[PDB]
Structure 1
Amino acid sequence: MLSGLNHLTLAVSQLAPSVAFYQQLLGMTLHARWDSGAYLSCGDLWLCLSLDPQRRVTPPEESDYTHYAFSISEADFASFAARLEAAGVAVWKLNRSEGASHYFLDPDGHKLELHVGSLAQRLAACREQPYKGMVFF
């Protein structure tokens, strides 16, 4: 029986700028770094950065919608999004925001998101404004 996410591993092209991004800019906790990777945490999330020469810096128009969203509180959302824009972080665009969300890219073009709200909250909101063809179980 699967019980949740154990870890998320991102391939990165250059280790030092990626550690800097996740630790200095996003505030994650750095536990360990070595010649080919790093271990960070963000609450319960175990994040591994893995140096991979096969990682390409990929423009958002030519990668698919696979993305990783991090939780932030309603009180902190706007000020955190503002700090990312002030730091020059690149954005990516989608037809429609998933509620209160900010979409941004990491140095290698991984698609990230800040989002306020849980699954239960999204289900309740979607009952009032459903996607086309939506069915609830």
Structure 2
Amino acid sequence: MLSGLNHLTLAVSQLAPSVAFYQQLLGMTLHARWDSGAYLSCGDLWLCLSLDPQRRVTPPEESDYTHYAFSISEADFASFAARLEAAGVAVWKLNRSEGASHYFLDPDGHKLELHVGSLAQRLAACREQPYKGMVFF
């Protein structure tokens, strides 16, 4: 039986700028780094950055909608989003189609998101403003 996400591994093209992005800019905890990777945590999330010569810096119009959202409180959301904007972090989406979210890119174009709210809260919001064809189980 599967019980959750054990870890997220992101391939990165340049290890040091990626470590800086996740640790310095996003505030995640850096536990270890080596010549070809790093281990970080974000709350209970284990994040692995893996130096991969195959990773390409990918513009958002070239990649699909696969993305990774990080939880933030309602009190912290706007100032964190505004700080990323002021720091020049690139974006990839503007329309809030799934609640209070800020969509931004990592240095390699991994699609990231700040989001306020749980799945339960999402489902409750969708009952009032459902997607097309939506069924709840």
Q: TM-score under structure 1 normalisation?
A: 0.98
On the 8 A contact 2:36/2:51 being kept in 1, the answer is yes
Q: TM-score under structure 2 normalisation?
A: 0.98
Q: CA deviation at 1:114?
A: 0.1
Q: CA deviation at 1:94?
A: 5.9
Equivalenced residues, count? 137
Structure 1 residue ranges (4+ consecutive) displaced by more than 4 angstroms after TM superposition: none
Give CA-to-partner distance per residue, 1:56-100, whole Å, 9 cap, x none. 000000100000000000000000001000110000026543110
Say whether 1:38 aligns with 2:38.
Answer: yes
On the 8 A contact 2:94/2:102 being kept in 1, the answer is no
Give CA-to-partner distance per residue, 1:16-66, whole Å, 9 cap, x none. 000000000000000000000000000000000000000000000010000
User: Structure 1: which 5+ runs fail to align?
Assistant: none
On the 8 A contact 2:29/2:42 being kept in 1, the answer is yes
User: Structure 2: which 5+ runs fail to align?
Assistant: none
**Alpha-carbon distance in 2 for matches of 1:97, 1:77:** 17
